[PDB]
Every structure is written in C-alpha cells, then in structure tokens.
Ligand binder design. Structure first.
Ligand code: FES
Ligand SMILES: [K+]
Ligand SMILES: [Mg+2]
Ligand SMILES: [Mg+2]
Ligand SMILES: [Mg+2]
Ligand SMILES: [Mg+2]
Ligand SMILES: [Mg+2]
Ligand SMILES: [Zn+2]
Lengths: 126, 197, 108, 74, 54, 170, 294, 53
RNA sequence: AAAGGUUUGGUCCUGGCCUUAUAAUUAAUUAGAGGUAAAAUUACACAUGCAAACCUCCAUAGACCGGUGUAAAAUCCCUUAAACAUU
C-alpha cells in the first residue's frame, strides 16, 4: 500500500505456528501490517525455552543503534527486551509489575500462615 | 495374524554372514533381483507406502519385506552399506532399490544413526578453524571493571528501588483523584517472598 | 546392449527415427570407432593427463606416448570453433527442462 | 476496522468512561520512574543520533574519501 | 551511569583502541531535559475541528 | 548444431569471460573498422570476438560500430567529462586491443571486489525468512529449539486447548 | 629468559613439516562425494612437471596445521545484579549481538538469569549461540555423539584417526576443553598401537609430534621413523626435543659432544629415552641393513 | 500509454468542496458550545470525559 | 523424456494423435483418532448483530489493519526534483 503519514518503528513480528510462537525483530513503517512489509530485520526472539532452558534473543545492536538514531520508535515489548538485555534501562512498568508481584505474594504467604494458625486452632480443638 | 519369527532378531548382523544368505543372495545386493510392477514405462515417483499391513503381506514384497530375517538396524552395517552409494556415499532414493517408503525411512534413520556412532564410514571434509584470530583479551570474553553501584550493592539506577513519596505529594494526589482512590501502598518487600507451597 | 558390452555408467539420447536396426547399427558403429587415451597419446605424441574434481589439482597421467614424447605444446585457441549441440548447451544456459527429465527410476 | 463513514453501534450508545482508580503511593513513584526513564533514553537516543551523523560525514568527507578522489584523477 | 551492557561495550572499546583509563562512562542529561507533561503547547500549530455537524 | 559461426560466442560462460569493466566515466565506445584489408584483421576479430564480452559487462555503455569510413581502424571512447580518448588499433591483435583498453579505461580488480562485498552487506545468516532471502524460515528448524507443531506434536501443557480447559476447571 | 618455542615458530613449523612428509596420492586421495565427469588435457613433460608443482603447492596449503592452543579460561563476569527482577522470570534469557562485522571472540553474549543477575555467557553457551546465528558448515549446534569414548574407540578400531581429528576441528574450538580432550585421546591411541603412519602426509601429524615432545614420549615415534628408513626425520625430532627442553640432560649432552645426524639419536637413548634400549637396537639394525646392503 | 484521460469531475469536485469549507467556516461559539445538563457538545454531540465534569 | 502405442499386404521415411510422470478443483464409492496448514462458485441482492476509539473539555485517531481482483497492456528496473496529512 501507499502510506501517507507514520513513522519508522522497531517491533516484534509474530511468526511460527499455532502454540509455537516465534518473533522477528524488525524495523518497519508503523502503518504496515504486523507481518507485512518491513525495512530491515534487526534480530529474532524465541520465547519458548530450548533444550537447555534458555529463551534466545538475537539483537543486531549496530543496526538497532542506527535506526534509533534516525527517529525509529520502540514498541513496549521491544523496550522490555532491551531492558532485560542491559542495552536500555529497565522499563518503569517492569519494576512496578515486579513490585506488585512482591506485594501480592506477601499476602499469599501471610494468608497461608493465618490458615496454618487457624489449622493450629483446629489442632488445639482436636 | 502370525508373522514368522526371525532367529537373528537379537544379532541381525549374523544373518548376512550365514550360509543361508550366501545361497539366496550371493555377493549381489539384496535388491538386485527385484522388479516393480507398474503400468507404463515411467514408474510412479514413490514406492508403495508399506508392504505389510496387520501381519498381511502385499503382492510383490519389497527387498527388505520379502525376507523376514533381514533386519534394518544401525548395527547391521553390512546391510546398510548396500543402500548407500559406494562412490558418492549418497543414500539411494526408494525407487532405486524398490524398497517401500516405510522401510526406506527406517533405512535412512539406521544409516544416519550408524554414521553418528562411527559404525558406518562417511567422508569428512577438511574445514579451517572458525576464527582468524584466537585472542581472548577483549572485554566481551574478559573481566569488565565492576561498576561503582555493583561494588557498593546499590541498584544500578536510584529509581529502580522504591523511594517513599513526600507526604505533601501524596495529599496532592488524594485531592486530584478524590472519590476514585485505592488504598495507599507502602514500601514493597525487600526480597521476593518465597513462593508458598 | 550396454549390459551385454559391460558398460556400467553412461548417458545417451536417441532422436529422429526409432528404427531398432538403425539404432543397433549406429550404436555399434559409434562405440567401435571411438579413440582410447593410449591411441590419442600416440597420434599427437603428448601425455594424456586427467583432472578430477574429487582429487583436487592432482594431475593423473592416463596414457603416455609409446615412442618419442614431443616438446611442442598442442595449440590452444583463444576461442574454439567447436560445433555445439543446442540440447547440451541449453541446459547450462538456465532453460527449464521437461517434467520427464531425470525422474526417479529403478536401478539399471 | 470500521471507517469514519460507518454507523456507530447501538449496543454502545450508553458507554461512558470509567477512569481507573489511583493509588497515591504507587502512582507517584511510577510517574517519577517514567520521567527519569525517559530522560535516560533521550540521552541515549541523542548519542545514537550523533554516531549516525559522525559515521556519515567520515564516509562523505573523511581522510580516506578525499585521497581516493584525487588518486583516481592523477 | 550508562546501562549495564552499554557501559561494558564502551569500556571494551577503550581497551581495544589502546585507551587505558578507569573513568566511568557517564551520560549527560542536560542536553535532553523533558518539560512537564502539562506544559502549555503551541496553539498555533494545533488542529481545529471540522464544520460538519454530527 | 547451434547455428552461425563460432556458436560458443553465444554461451553465457563465454560472455562472462570478458575482463574489461569500464570506469564510470566511459559513456560511449565507437568502433571504426574496415571489412577488407590486411592491417585491420585484428580489429575485425575484436568486433567478432570481443565486442559481445565488452557489452555484457558494460550494459549501459553505447557501443556503435561504423564500417569502411576511414583508411585505418580505431577506437574512440567518449567520457562523461567530455574528453575523447582515441585509440589506434591498426596492426594490433584482438587480444592486444583488449589489454590496451583494459589498462587505460578499465576498472582495477581491487575496485571490483569491493563493490561485490558491499552489495551483500544486508544479507545476514542469522536472519529468518523465506528461502529466497534467508537460510531458515523459522527457529523451529534450528537444532535444540522447540520443533514445529506440524512435524512434532507439542506437549499438552504447552497448548492453548489444554490451558483453556484448566482455566474453566479452576 | 630464552623464550619457549611455540607451535607457530618458523623453526618449529619447518621441522614439523619435514617429519610429517608429503604424498600427493595421500593428500589428494579421492573423496567419497558426488562425482563429475573428469576432464583431460594433453601436456608435454614440461607442462606435466609444472602441473605437479602446482599440485605440491596445493598440498602445502592443504596440509596447513591446525592451531595448538592452551585451554581457555572460564568466563565468570557479572555485569549487573538487578534484584528487582528476582522471581519475575522462570527461564534465562540469552542475548547475542549479531552485528556482522565483529569477530566472534569479541561479541557480547550476555545472560539475564531468573535471579536478575546479568552475566557474560559461558564458553559453551557462546559457541552454541554463534552456531545458531553464524552457522559453520561442518559444525552442529549441539555436541555430536560421535565424540563419546565408546564411539571414539570404535573409530580407532577402524583406523579412522584422521577423521576423528577432522571432526574435532569442524565442531570444537582449538582452545576448548573438548578439543584438547579428543586430540589428546587420539594421539595417545596412536602411540600405544604404533599407528603413526595413519597421520603422515596429513595436517594432524605436527600436533601429534608436538604432544609427544612436550609430554616427553617421542620414544615410539623415533623407533617407528627409524624402522621406516626415515632417519632424517628421527634426527629432526631429536632436534625439536632438544629445543623445547634445553636444560634437559639430553640437550646438554649433545652440546658437550657436538653430536649431529645419527649421533643425536644415540645421545637421546642413553640420556632421556624412556625406552632407550630399543632405539639403539632399531637404529643399529638400520645401520646394519644400510651398511650390509649398501 | 496515452489512454489515461483527464478527470474533469474529480478536479471540479475537489475545488468546489474546498471553497464551501472556507465560506461556511464555523465559529468558536458553535464548535465549543456546551449543554451543561448533559455535558455534551451540541455541534458534534461529543460528551466530555468524566474527570472534567 | 531413457521413451512407448497407433498409417501399410509388407518395408523405410515423414507426421499428427494418444499413453506412461506431477499437481489443483469437482464428482462417484469408501473412511478411526491426533497434530498442522489451507479454506476458494459469483464486483449478483442482502434480514440481524458486531468490526474505532481514547480522553480533565482542546486535539489525535477512525487515511491504518481487514476485503476483493473492478478497471487497465496495464508494468518492471532506473534517473531527477520536490515535498510529507510524518518521526
Ligand atoms: S514453521 Fe516453525 S513452528 Fe511451524
Ligand atoms: K509416432
Ligand atoms: Mg492534553
Ligand atoms: Mg500409406
Ligand atoms: Mg467434495
Ligand atoms: Mg492488507
Ligand atoms: Mg477484469
Ligand atoms: Zn516393503
């Protein structure tokens, strides 16, 4: 298609089959389809653990730096990948979500202890 | 429903050296005296899927299926050699020897397994080392100087940790979103609480 | 006929008329009027050397002149005047072959 | 997806916004993380923008670029 | 500071080029400072609604 | 039998044997040769054998040939700067003419090698995609990675059909 | 300090090339691979000798010895420890820089562990991922099963040592532990069974003699070189042994007596030979055969 | 080519439409009018967000 | 194409047709489960529901994604200039 307006973006293009996802990191005009016309492929992401239990991300850091220097935006999933790698700082919501998970597990542990204490009362009753 | 039982099941390689094998086959391959029955002069590009269905055998059993004592095993290298080109070392396609597609797949796996364990020889090309230079002094493969925060034990950036908001700022947000508020949360646990089990 | 002669590896194409007698007479005519490497070395007086791609640059001498070895190199033209067959050349020019070509067939 | 000339759904005439509820302590901490995060990323995007322009200028008018041009003429 | 991986790539390049130093790479934030989100925007370049009534 | 004389001239291998790749300045090469004579034999062979090879490697250069217009054969190159390079090819073999033009107006081997490497800069082995552009279409092809569900059925716990059933069960 | 000789030292490469030998028939033995119809050229004796010269030039490049290196040191560097991300992920992430123009040993391959530690990838992890993104013909992503001791012993029974080593070079890196393990196991089997001829006119002979010299077990190779009438090779081996062990009693004895030629081998027998009695016997028998017949 | 032909109606339409826009430009008193009972703009029928009520 | 069948009382030559290989759709008869891919008579007419919102008012978006193969020898490849409803 002949797009009018839009910007270059670095995003994940979904590949693979059903229940077997595989991603291609690409630089593409934002208005193009998710799996359609792109400008350059900048790496790949395999989200499924392999035989060694490792999720494999490949980043062409020389081309990624080139396209960020030319105005390319980043999708939120790609910003999360760059933060985990260490090339970018950790995303604010990566930290906030980790804090929410910590507060949510603390409640669960406390509830189990309360249930165990309630179970202890049942043991006292015999 | 009674397929014959081979005496050489445990040691398949034995059959190919026994006198019975020599009389039946001599020194020619086991597919030498097999011919496929088909209409036309150009044959179909695939052989029959399988010669044996539920203990029944087809009209013209293929070289492997016709002889029950023949066993396709990675250890039976002498049988496997007959299905590999001596000059090019390429496994023959199924139409070449006339074996059924089931046994051709089984033969291909046995030949590949025999080669991997070294029982069956194949040509190993000579390839140069991967890297022109074998130095290991670059930072990628060496020790990077530890960052100041890492030595002290602090977070890489100050905002990675929870910094309690000023009390005046918490009141400013309670006024802005008055009537649609949630219970205020304190500092999060220092570590990840161990999963309850 | 090739099995009767003992030839094990060869390619052939027959075109024009498929007359069985003319094919047998023409086949024997050509096969009997070929030139062995030993004959070629004697006619030209030079060594006949063989270069296989599976043996690398190793030169293989297959026939040496019976009498006196010459010292004048055989003339190598810049561009040969050979008469080429379109059927042989067409393949190397990238032209698609027929669906009937190089089909999987039983061992001969 | 609908075009601007398509009619609105009738099941959705009632819709009104229901803004999320705000936790004061975590909302403020998150707002500061976004401000500091976006400052770091703008400093890195600027540094990446300079490497692109430095590399381009070296190719266009670098030492090696000028010598080859005259070498060909000579 | 620089991000953890990007800091290691800078220090590694220093050693390769022969630059020997223990200086810590530092990002400069003065050139790229963000305005508050509620800062007044440029009204001159803002769009105006069309004149077709709904 | 391929028609014409020297049918090898009409083969892709022969056309690719040409070694004269002109510099970007070269725009036109006019060839003035005589069909009869003795001192112009090399020029006639140059038109017969070499002009096809030159054009094959220089598709954008205009080669126009004129016959029996002058007493002697010559080659004149027209450059983009406006310079005109006259060459005298009388009493010169066709091979000698090719070597002469290669020296004065032919790109060097180093220049041609650099261009070939630059052309392939954007092909990466790691890149995944169609066979025309990439070695592997999917990471399932790689050894050790989770195989394609079509070839190998996935474990039940890794399937949305199974996971959705549990969520209903919960 | 007098520098310890290296594998690539121009002097060592000279001696190792000589003892290895050349044989155009063994170096260019026909490969069992897809074949093409041979080509034929009529050549004079001058042209034929020129063609043999180019064949020997190619046999030199073909016999180039593979590097002999020390075992690499484990990569144990922690770039960061972001504990905020502890417990938020179950599987490790492996990030590989796939910029085309970086040498593979200068690429950054990091691992973000579930604890949050950002560390550099180990050597085994580095080689696996570089195969996935820069695949090398001959190498497999996961270690093959042919290199297991039981499988390797089978290849040795079939006298396929040159293949075991050609496979070890396509798969493993020269400084890896697996590379050193397989090579040292192949070289050790050749010694015990006296199969030194298998690797002659091959690129693997130099490393084998190097391994014996450094491990002070050249005795078998001298006995076998002498019995094959290659006594110029045996002397050169004693020169290499007197070069890598200058302070050895044998090297000091040869300086005292200014021994040369067959004398050098006799000096080794008396001074440092593990089995000196046999070296003299084989050396003596060789001299008797040479003197008696000629 | 030369079988691609002018589109007079298309050219006429574009100009004519643009002219009407300039002639019948609305004013701020109409575009930004509000119905305070429903908090909806009569011009476009755009109901203001909840946090602004 | 590695070819074969078929003109005649018979032979040779010429020459067409057809067979043998591969794949898609529909149809006849017949059929267990599982995984995966694809889903397609018709630019003829369409009941019903849904497919574009967001948001402290202004703006932004609904110009995309998705669909079909209408028109048209319609194009490919390349050069030059210019903007951009952009970043
Ligand atoms: S093609 Fe890769 S998962 Fe199916
Ligand atoms: K016919
Ligand atoms: Mg606003
Ligand atoms: Mg007739
Ligand atoms: Mg049907
Ligand atoms: Mg589309
Ligand atoms: Mg139409
Ligand atoms: Zn069968």
């Amino acid at each position: 298609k002949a797009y009018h307006g839009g910007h270059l973006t670095i995003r994940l293009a979904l590949g693979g089959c059903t229940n077997r996802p595989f991603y291609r990191i690409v630089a593409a005009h934002n208005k193009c389809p998710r799996d359609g016309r792109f400008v350059e492929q900048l790496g790949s992401y395999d989200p499924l653990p392999n035989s060694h239990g490792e999720k494999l991300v490949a980043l062409n850091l020389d081309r990624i730096r080139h396209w960020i220097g030319c105005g390319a935006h980043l999708s939120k999933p790609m910003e999360k990948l760059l933060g985990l790698s260490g090339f970018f700082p950790l995303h604010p919501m990566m930290i906030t979500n980790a804090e929410r998970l910590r507060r949510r597990r603390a409640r669960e542990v406390l509830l189990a202890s309360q249930k165990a204490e309630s179970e202890a009362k049942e043991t006292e009753a015999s | 429903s009674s397929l014959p039982v081979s005496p050489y099941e445990s040691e398949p390689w034995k059959y190919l050296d026994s006198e019975e094998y020599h009389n039946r086959y001599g020194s020619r391959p086991v597919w030498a005296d097999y011919r496929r029955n088909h209409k036309g002069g150009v044959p179909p590009q695939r052989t029959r899927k399988t010669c044996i269905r539920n203990n029944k055998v087809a009209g013209n059993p293929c070289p492997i299926c016709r002889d029950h004592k023949l066993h396709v095993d990675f250890r039976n290298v002498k049988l496997l050699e007959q299905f590999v080109c001596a000059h090019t070392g390429i496994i023959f396609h199924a139409p070449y020897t006339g074996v059924c597609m089931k046994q051709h797949k089984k033969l291909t796996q046995a030949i590949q397994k025999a080669r991997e364990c070294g029982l069956l020889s194949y040509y190993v090309p000579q390839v140069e080392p991967r890297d022109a230079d074998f130095g290991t002094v670059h930072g990628a493969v060496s020790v990077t100087p530890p960052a100041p925060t890492l030595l002290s034990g602090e977070p890489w950036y100050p905002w990675y940790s929870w910094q309690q908001p000023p009390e005046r700022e918490l009141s400013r947000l309670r006024r802005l979103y008055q009537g649609n508020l949630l219970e205020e949360s304190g500092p999060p646990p220092e570590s990840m609480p161990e999963m309850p089990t | 006929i090739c099995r009767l002669i003992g030839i094990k590896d060869m390619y052939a194409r027959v075109t024009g008329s498929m007359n069985m007698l003319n094919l047998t007479r023409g086949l024997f005519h050509g096969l009997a009027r070929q030139e062995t490497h030993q004959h070629l070395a004697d006619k030209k007086g030079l060594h006949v050397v063989e270069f296989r791609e599976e043996c690398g640059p190793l030169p293989i001498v297959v026939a040496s002149p019976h009498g006196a070895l010459s010292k004048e190199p055989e003339p190598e033209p810049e561009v040969p005047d050979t008469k080429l067959d379109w059927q042989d050349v067409k393949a190397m020019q990238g032209l698609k072959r027929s669906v009937w070509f190089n089909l999987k067939r039983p061992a001969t | 997806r609908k075009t601007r000339h398509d009619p609105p759904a009738k099941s959705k005439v009632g819709r009104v916004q229901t803004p999320p509820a705000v936790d004061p302590a975590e909302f403020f901490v998150l707002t500061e993380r976004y401000r500091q995060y976006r400052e770091t990323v703008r400093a890195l995007r600027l540094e990446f923008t300079l490497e692109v322009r430095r590399k381009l200028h070296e190719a266009r008018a670098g030492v090696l670029a000028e010598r080859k041009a005259q070498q060909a003429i000579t | 500071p620089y991000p953890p991986l990007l800091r290691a790539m800078i220090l590694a390049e220093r050693q390769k080029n022969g630059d020997t130093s223990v200086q810590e790479p530092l990002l400069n934030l003065e050139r790229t400072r963000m305005r508050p989100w509620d800062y007044p925007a440029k009204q001159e370049t803002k769009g105006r609604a069309k004149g077709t009534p709904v | 039998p391929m028609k014409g004389r020297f049918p090898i001239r009409r083969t892709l291998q022969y056309l690719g044997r040409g070694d004269v790749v002109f510099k970007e300045s070269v725009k036109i090469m006019t060839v003035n040769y005589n069909t009869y004579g003795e001192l112009g034999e090399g020029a006639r062979k140059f038109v017969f054998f070499n002009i096809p090879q030159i054009q094959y490697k220089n598709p954008w250069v205009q080669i126009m040939m004129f016959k029996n217009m002058t007493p002697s054969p010559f080659l004149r190159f027209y450059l983009d700067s406006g310079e005109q390079v006259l060459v005298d090819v009388e009493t010169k073999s066709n091979k000698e003419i090719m070597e002469h033009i290669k020296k004065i107006l032919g790109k060097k081997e180093e220049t041609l090698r650099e261009e070939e490497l630059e052309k392939q800069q954007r092909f990466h082995p790691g890149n995944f995609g169609p066979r025309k552009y990439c070695l592997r279409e999917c990471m399932c092809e790689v050894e050790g990675q989770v195989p394609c569900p079509g070839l190998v059925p996935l474990p039940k716990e890794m399937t949305g059909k199974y996971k959705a059933a549990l969520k209903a069960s919960t | 300090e007098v520098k310890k000789p290296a594998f690539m030292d121009e002097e060592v490469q000279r001696i190792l090339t000589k003892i290895t030998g050349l044989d155009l028939q063994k170096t260019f033995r026909p490969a069992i691979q897809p074949l093409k119809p041979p080509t034929y050229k009529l050549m004079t004796q001058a042209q034929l000798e020129e063609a043999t010269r180019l064949a020997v030039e190619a046999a030199k490049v073909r016999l180039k010895m593979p590097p002999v290196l020390e075992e690499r040191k484990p990569i144990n560097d922690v770039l960061a420890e972001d504990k905020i991300l502890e417990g938020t992920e179950t599987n490790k992430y492996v990030f590989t820089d796939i910029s085309y123009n970086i040498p593979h040993r200068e690429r950054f391959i990091v691992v973000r562990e579930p604890s949050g530690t950002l560390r550099k990838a180990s050597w085994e992890e580095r080689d696996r991922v570089i195969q996935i993104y820069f695949p090398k013909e001959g190498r497999r992503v996961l270690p093959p099963v042919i290199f297991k001791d039981e499988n390797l012993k089978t290849m040795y029974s079939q006298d396929r040592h040159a293949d075991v080593l050609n496979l070890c070079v396509a798969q493993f890196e020269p400084d890896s532990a697996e590379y050193i393990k397989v090579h040292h196991q192949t070289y050790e089997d050749i010694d015990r069974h006296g199969k030194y001829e298998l690797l002659r006119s091959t690129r693997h002979f130099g490393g084998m003699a190097w391994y014996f010299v450094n491990k002070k077990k050249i005795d078998g190779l001298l006995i076998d070189q002498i019995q094959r009438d290659l006594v110029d090779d045996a002397t050169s081996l004693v020169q290499l042994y007197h070069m890598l062990h200058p302070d050895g009693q044998s090297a000091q004895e040869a300086k005292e007596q200014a021994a040369e030629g067959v004398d050098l081998i006799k000096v080794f027998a008396k001074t440092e030979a593990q089995r000196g009695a046999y070296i003299e016997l084989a050396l003596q028998t060789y001299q008797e055969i040479v003197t008696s017949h000629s | 080519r030369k079988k691609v032909r002018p589109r007079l109606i298309a050219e006429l339409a574009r100009r004519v439409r643009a002219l009407r826009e300039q002639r019948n430009q609305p004013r701020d008193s109409q575009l930004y009018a509000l119905d305070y009972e429903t908090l909806t703009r009569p011009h476009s029928g755009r109901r203001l967000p909840v946090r602004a009520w």
